[PDB]
Amino acid sequence: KRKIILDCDPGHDDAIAIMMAAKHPAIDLLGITIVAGNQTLDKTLINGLNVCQKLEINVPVYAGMPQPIMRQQIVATGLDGPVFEPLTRQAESTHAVKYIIDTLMASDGDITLVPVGPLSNIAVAMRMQPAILPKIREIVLMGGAYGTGNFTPSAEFNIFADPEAARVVFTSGVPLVMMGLDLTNQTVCTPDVIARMERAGGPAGELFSDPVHDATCIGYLINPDGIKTQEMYVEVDVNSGPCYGRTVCDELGVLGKPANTKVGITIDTDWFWGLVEECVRGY
Amino acid sequence: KRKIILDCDPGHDDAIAIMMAAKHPAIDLLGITIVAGNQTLDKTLINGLNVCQKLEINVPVYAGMPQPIMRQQIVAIHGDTGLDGPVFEPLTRQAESTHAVKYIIDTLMASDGDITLVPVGPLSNIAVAMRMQPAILPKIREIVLMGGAYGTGNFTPSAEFNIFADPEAARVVFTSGVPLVMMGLDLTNQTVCTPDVIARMERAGGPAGELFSDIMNFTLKTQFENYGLAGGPVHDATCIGYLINPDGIKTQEMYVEVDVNSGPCYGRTVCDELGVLGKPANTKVGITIDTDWFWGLVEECVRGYIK
Amino acid sequence: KRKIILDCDPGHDDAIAIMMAAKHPAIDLLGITIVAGNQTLDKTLINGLNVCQKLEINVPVYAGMPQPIMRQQIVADNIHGDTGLDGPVFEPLTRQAESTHAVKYIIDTLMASDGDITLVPVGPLSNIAVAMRMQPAILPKIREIVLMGGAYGTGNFTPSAEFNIFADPEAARVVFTSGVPLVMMGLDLTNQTVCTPDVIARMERAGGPAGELFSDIMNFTLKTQFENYGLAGGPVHDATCIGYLINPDGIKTQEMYVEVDVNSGPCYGRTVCDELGVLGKPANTKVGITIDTDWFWGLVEECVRGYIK
Amino acid sequence: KRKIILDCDPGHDDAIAIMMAAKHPAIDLLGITIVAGNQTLDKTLINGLNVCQKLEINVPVYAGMPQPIMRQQIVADTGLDGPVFEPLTRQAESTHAVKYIIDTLMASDGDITLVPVGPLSNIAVAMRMQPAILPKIREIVLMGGAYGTGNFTPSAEFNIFADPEAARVVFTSGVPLVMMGLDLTNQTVCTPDVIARMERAGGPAGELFSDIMNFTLKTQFENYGLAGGPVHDATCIGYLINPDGIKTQEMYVEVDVNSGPCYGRTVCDELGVLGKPANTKVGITIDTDWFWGLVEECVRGYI
Ligand SMILES: O=c1[nH]cnc2c1ncn2[C@@H]1O[C@H](CO)[C@@H](O)[C@H]1O
Ligand SMILES: O=c1[nH]cnc2c1ncn2[C@@H]1O[C@H](CO)[C@@H](O)[C@H]1O
Ligand SMILES: O=c1[nH]cnc2c1ncn2[C@@H]1O[C@H](CO)[C@@H](O)[C@H]1O
Numbered sequence A: 001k002r003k004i005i006l007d008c009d010p011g012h013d014d015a016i017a018i019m020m021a022a023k024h025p026a027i028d029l030l031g032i033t034i035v036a037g038n039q040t041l042d043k044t045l046i047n048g049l050n051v052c053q054k055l056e057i058n059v060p061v062y063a064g065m066p067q068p069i070m071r072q073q074i075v076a077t078g079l080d081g082p083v084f085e086p087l088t089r090q091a092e093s094t095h096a097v098k099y100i101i102d103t104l105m106a107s108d109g110d111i112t113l114v115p116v117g118p119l120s121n122i123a124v125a126m127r128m129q130p131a132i133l134p135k136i137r138e139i140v141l142m143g144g145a146y147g148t149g150n151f152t153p154s155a156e157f158n159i160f161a162d163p164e165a166a167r168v169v170f171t172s173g174v175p176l177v178m179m180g181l182d183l184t185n186q187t188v189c190t191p192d193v194i195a196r197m198e199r200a201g202g203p204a205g206e207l208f209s210d211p212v213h214d215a216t217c218i219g220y221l222i223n224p225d226g227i228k229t230q231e232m233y234v235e236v237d238v239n240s241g242p243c244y245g246r247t248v249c250d251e252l253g254v255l256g257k258p259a260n261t262k263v264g265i266t267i268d269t270d271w272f273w274g275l276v277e278e279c280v281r282g283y
Numbered sequence B: 001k002r003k004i005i006l007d008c009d010p011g012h013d014d015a016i017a018i019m020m021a022a023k024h025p026a027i028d029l030l031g032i033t034i035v036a037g038n039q040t041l042d043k044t045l046i047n048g049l050n051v052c053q054k055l056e057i058n059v060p061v062y063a064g065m066p067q068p069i070m071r072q073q074i075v076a077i078h079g080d081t082g083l084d085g086p087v088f089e090p091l092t093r094q095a096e097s098t099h100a101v102k103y104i105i106d107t108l109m110a111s112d113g114d115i116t117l118v119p120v121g122p123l124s125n126i127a128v129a130m131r132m133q134p135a136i137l138p139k140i141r142e143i144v145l146m147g148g149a150y151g152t153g154n155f156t157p158s159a160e161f162n163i164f165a166d167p168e169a170a171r172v173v174f175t176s177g178v179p180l181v182m183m184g185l186d187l188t189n190q191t192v193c194t195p196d197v198i199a200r201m202e203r204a205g206g207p208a209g210e211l212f213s214d215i216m217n218f219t220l221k222t223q224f225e226n227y228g229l230a231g232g233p234v235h236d237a238t239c240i241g242y243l244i245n246p247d248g249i250k251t252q253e254m255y256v257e258v259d260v261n262s263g264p265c266y267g268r269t270v271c272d273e274l275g276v277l278g279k280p281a282n283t284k285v286g287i288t289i290d291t292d293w294f295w296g297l298v299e300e301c302v303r304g305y306i307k
Numbered sequence C: 001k002r003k004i005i006l007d008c009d010p011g012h013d014d015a016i017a018i019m020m021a022a023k024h025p026a027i028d029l030l031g032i033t034i035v036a037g038n039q040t041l042d043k044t045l046i047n048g049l050n051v052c053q054k055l056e057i058n059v060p061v062y063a064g065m066p067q068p069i070m071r072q073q074i075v076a077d078n079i080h081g082d083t084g085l086d087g088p089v090f091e092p093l094t095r096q097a098e099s100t101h102a103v104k105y106i107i108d109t110l111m112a113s114d115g116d117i118t119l120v121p122v123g124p125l126s127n128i129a130v131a132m133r134m135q136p137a138i139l140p141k142i143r144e145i146v147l148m149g150g151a152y153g154t155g156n157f158t159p160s161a162e163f164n165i166f167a168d169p170e171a172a173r174v175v176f177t178s179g180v181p182l183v184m185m186g187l188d189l190t191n192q193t194v195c196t197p198d199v200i201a202r203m204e205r206a207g208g209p210a211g212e213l214f215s216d217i218m219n220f221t222l223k224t225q226f227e228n229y230g231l232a233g234g235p236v237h238d239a240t241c242i243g244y245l246i247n248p249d250g251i252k253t254q255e256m257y258v259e260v261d262v263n264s265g266p267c268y269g270r271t272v273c274d275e276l277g278v279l280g281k282p283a284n285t286k287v288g289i290t291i292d293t294d295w296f297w298g299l300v301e302e303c304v305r306g307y308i309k
Numbered sequence D: 001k002r003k004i005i006l007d008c009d010p011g012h013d014d015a016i017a018i019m020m021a022a023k024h025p026a027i028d029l030l031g032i033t034i035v036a037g038n039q040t041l042d043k044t045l046i047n048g049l050n051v052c053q054k055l056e057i058n059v060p061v062y063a064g065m066p067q068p069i070m071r072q073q074i075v076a077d078t079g080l081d082g083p084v085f086e087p088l089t090r091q092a093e094s095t096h097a098v099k100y101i102i103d104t105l106m107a108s109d110g111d112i113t114l115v116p117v118g119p120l121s122n123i124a125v126a127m128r129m130q131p132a133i134l135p136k137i138r139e140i141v142l143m144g145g146a147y148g149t150g151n152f153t154p155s156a157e158f159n160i161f162a163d164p165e166a167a168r169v170v171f172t173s174g175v176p177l178v179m180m181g182l183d184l185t186n187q188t189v190c191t192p193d194v195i196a197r198m199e200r201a202g203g204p205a206g207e208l209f210s211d212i213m214n215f216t217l218k219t220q221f222e223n224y225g226l227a228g229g230p231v232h233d234a235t236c237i238g239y240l241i242n243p244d245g246i247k248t249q250e251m252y253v254e255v256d257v258n259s260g261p262c263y264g265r266t267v268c269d270e271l272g273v274l275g276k277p278a279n280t281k282v283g284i285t286i287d288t289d290w291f292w293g294l295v296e297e298c299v300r301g302y303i
């Protein structure tokens, strides 16, 4: 069992990630922290609460940063589709940043952080209490692209949305795994993938019905052998201009700097969609 | 009475600011938040606690950010402890458990909007609170900060130490839309504390006059070899002076922008003196201070501590 | 026949490009202008002159910019050796650079023209940016620019940047904002043209002075392109520009909005190419995607054999 | 006698610089090179020709760069309103300014000073086109930059802002530099009482000075709040005639080429906090009595 904290901005694929992480026996989901991203924090928080309520997930939810550490905010209800009953659960009182710090400090150094939105909560905690750093076993994140980005030619949305936060994470010295668009764009969810999930049915199959980037991070923790990675020296570009929020990945090793990231190259989509169905079934 | 939260990284002149703010009847000092800067947070916290203990100041002290929001940390001039000179009895005073950033947020949220923030170190605590809880922004009556320079910086030709130590944080503060007053190096360098000014405070005596001497006798050697100023300026204390009586300080309204480009102007406050950009002013920038009024004010506070 | 001015910094693959352009009946090679890049201008000029003398090419050679327009100079001795063209033997030079400066030659020749000359830059863009700014009126006179440079994916010299752009980004920023029709043969395309031992042996078989020069030349970079980037042979990057002019149907291109990054830092000299059109800006460049290597190596051989006596 | 090449974009104060350099026995004016700046090159050229024709100055004029080396062009209406000039009876040489600068320097004995008082496009193009001119240049005395507040932007003085990249080449060239920035040149404000003084000396140069400085009187005040058009460019000529009228301080200077709020800033290390060796003598103060006396002395040489 891998103990995780899932930090997220739901979010359609965030919702799938919550669904998988909460259900698989190889994941111990300690709690969910919410960050503004896909939509404003008031909205992402409600989406996150709704997902857990609908699926009857019993995991503490904590609200975190409603804004990036420095830049002017950008966004993508941020989860249109499924229909939700009136909301009967709320955020914990504790702020997400504090939760992350205290839980890591109290821990034995075996918790993995899994950020799949902009990195505001992670950067604030790291700088607020630098002593958490050797406590983090690993960070498996959804973000970046070694090739073309999405929001801009240069940048993937999660990094573009808080580049300065991303810079802190990438220079933290903690073990990093990056599932970027080069990998996650391979996990396109076509009508017959949806139909397959509908057929499995139950509350998770119906929610899935109403690409799937963030779920690959859970995938990777459940079984790293479905995903090929390559170690690289990665640097985050924080220049204003055409490459703001680019993750510059040194594929060929021409800078002669030691690798700081395992970067996602390819994913076995058969293994992966099998894993999604396996989780949909647990519900 | 102006309610303030004093955010600081003591620090020699920070200690002078603490001394003034805590004593003057025109200032209601709600609490002191500490930020890393002049020295690491472990050290600035102790220096802050030591000042308050020595002067028997009864105000809650909160530890905040031990690092800037993005850049690689730098420290200052102020020595190994960051407050060399005075000798302090063992510290029996302790920091609050609540983190400074939470303290700032909750206090502002609970308030009626008339608390002024007075940051005189790097702006890490301020930027984290503003982004953590954006709703504090209309609650802040004004920010009166020590930082920046429209002319020459000190740490680099372009940048003053407080801004240079966390430019990104500074950019957050300067784009917040909250009323800002900036006491930059252009103003604060006029407040050089020469041997006669020290001798004057020694003469007033008591615990605050002795501390003033011990502290400011150290930054006599150390502000000369670095910048060639007639003595240690008392930068941070001008913020308290501004609140006590704004008429002793001439300000000019300007459009101000913080440069976060890596390179020769990283952490520069770019001030539009002449209005060439056609942008509305966002800052009242310190131009000149009446040093006679000001040193008189310093003495007046020093004397409030004679038992 | 496409009239061209070939601007280059020879350079191993530059020499292959000179060999092809001078010989193919579909190309009218008006002149060769030289720029510092691969090596310093003193060296790239000699390498240029040696190639033409060896192959008995009768085309005026002009020396241009010995330095980039703004940045601190860099070379590629690592890829191209101490001389900038290690490999072949050359007899002492019995020819020399024209007296006219390359930049003036480019300007006057374009001004005097009927607007049908194509520029073919395959080194840093110093000569092209200086002419464009020195005489803005040349701009409508340029039919097209077909350049070797950039990369929409990974660069070579840095993770972000390909050498020709990296060596003068500001010059590049001039070219890419010029409004002249651009074709960019970047590393994404040109890395597909690796020259393995079998390709070399093919050209050796065709023989004559161009086949021998090809062999002497591409054996050097065979090993440096393997030591530095892990490539299977030394690509013939620059020759793809000539190839494109001889027959554009061997090369697949996609129109894109392209922008050169002049920020100091990790993306200095990156060509940022908007593959998916997310910026809603009109395309300014045809970007090389794929090359038919069978067509291309056949074309190389066809040129090599035009030199057998 | 100091041999000079005067590189300029006339320009009201450029014209005063042309007037002084051409007349003073301590200056040997070899030629005038023109750059786009104040106005487009077609305009700055004509202005430069008109000044020499009116004052009967017999010095070759050469047209140079019509555009900066990289950025989008900016200007500061003919570029020299005020004086009335007859129809032009002279023309520019045929040699391009950049080639002129290179050949003249290469042929020289290393005794020529360059005096740039517009954007640095001609200088940066020559330096990079023929790096061998560098040890040949005795000194560069330029009007440009500001260690304090700029004019065109809070950070940048016009000449640098108009071609920062060209400026970065000049400042990293290793050639001896003297910089007459706005911090110095703003002290040389030309008020109605200074104009009336030159009117009184009279002749063709006194009349031109009046017609010219009357225009800038209005447009310096509305734009920068100044008491009357400073005479920026003429200070470089002043500095060569007699350096003792001007106090300088040696500083490490760096040009900022970042896009953003400090594009085209000269960053001057006043206090030496970087620990880098100085590369520039920066103008601090000027004796305005000495200086105006010198202007009059030159105005008088034209009777
Ligand atoms: O179309 C979209 N617009 C904006 N954001 C998206 C879209 N699709 C996915 N994401 C969100 O951005 C991250 C990586 O791009 C993913 O984690 C996903 O939640
Ligand atoms: O010489 C110095 N170097 C760096 N920081 C300093 C120095 N003197 C004081 N401070 C601290 O930084 C701000 C002044 O710019 C002041 O807040 C002071 O506390
Ligand atoms: O692998 C390389 N690294 C750097 N420069 C190279 C390499 N191969 C060729 N060239 C030289 O630089 C340009 C293409 O990048 C080509 O124009 C060539 O002359």
Ligand SMILES: O=c1[nH]cnc2c1ncn2[C@@H]1O[C@H](CO)[C@@H](O)[C@H]1O
Residues within 6 Å of the ligand: D011, D012, D013, D014, D038, D076, D117, D118, D143, D151, D152, D157, D158, D159, D219, D220, D223, D232, D233
């Ligand atoms: O008011 C003005 N705005 C902009 N440029 C000016 C002005 N007056 C003169 N110059 C031109 O710009 C340079 C220094 O700013 C001087 O060389 C001058 O010729």
Ligand SMILES: [Ca+2]
Residues within 6 Å of the ligand: A008, A009, A010, A011, A013, A014, A037, A038, A116, A117, A214
């Ligand atoms: Ca997400």
Ligand SMILES: [Ca+2]
Residues within 6 Å of the ligand: B008, B009, B010, B011, B013, B014, B038, B120, B121, B236
């Ligand atoms: Ca302080």
Ligand SMILES: [Ca+2]
Residues within 6 Å of the ligand: C008, C009, C010, C011, C013, C014, C038, C122, C123, C238
């Ligand atoms: Ca080449």
Ligand SMILES: [Ca+2]
Residues within 6 Å of the ligand: D008, D009, D010, D011, D013, D014, D038, D117, D118, D233
């Ligand atoms: Ca001028």
